[PDB]
Amino acid sequence: SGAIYVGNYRVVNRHLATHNDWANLVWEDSSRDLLVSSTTAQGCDTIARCDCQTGVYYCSSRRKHYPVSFSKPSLIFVEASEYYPARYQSHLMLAVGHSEPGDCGGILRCQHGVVGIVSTGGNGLVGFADVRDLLWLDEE
């Protein structure tokens, strides 16, 4: 589990969104595994606006933050899950790293701020849903 709290937005994996998230929905995109809901309190996270390919992510199944090199956001194949049919997830970045399903929501960050959240993984791969192109998270 995990979320990004930026301004009056809460960014979570769409597959982990709560009823309160759907009842206060701002935007959602199944192809990206992302959902954004509105919050009453202002958040402290800042979004990175960059093309970094190195950063650090949080892995809840190890209680550890790991430095990783990651690919550029792309259209990748993801295995069938009870959350998604096997399919093409967009804006996804891959790195070598431990992941379990519960780890989704962990933040990946670089020197500029939050880059994305754990979204996929398996066999020593971890995938991250990028949020750096969502410029509207910084306003309104």
Ligand X SMILES: NC(=O)C[C@@H]1CCCN(c2ncnc3ccccc23)C1
Residues identified as active-site:
15, 33, 104
Gyration radius from the chain CA atoms: 14
Per CB under 6 A, which region of 18-26, 47-55, 69-77, 112-120 contacts ligand X? 112-120
Which residues does a gap of C–N over 2.5 Å follow in the chain? Answer: none
What's phi and psi for 44, nearest 5 deg?
-105, -10
User: What 8-state DSSP symbol labels residue 81?
Assistant: -
| Measured distance CA(82)–CA(86) in Å, rounded | 10
CB of 41 to ligand X, least distance (A): 27
Decide if 79 contacts 86 (C-beta within 8 A). yes
Closer CB to Zn ion, 94 or 110, in the complex:
110
- The first and second tokens of residue 60, run together, are 């809840």
- The first and second tokens of residue 101, run together, are 């399903």
Q: Is 103 in the site for ligand X (CB under 6 A)?
A: yes
Q: Is 84 in the site for ligand X (CB under 6 A)?
A: yes
- Determine whether the annotation assigns residue 112 to a binding site: yes
**Of residues 70, 95, 116, 119, which one binds ligand X by CB under 6 A?**
119
- Determine whether the annotation assigns residue 52 to a binding site: yes
Point out the annotated binding site for Zn(2+): 50, 52, 110, 112
For ligand X, the binding residues (CB under 6 A) are 15, 33, 78, 81, 83-84, 89, 99-101, 103-104, 118-122
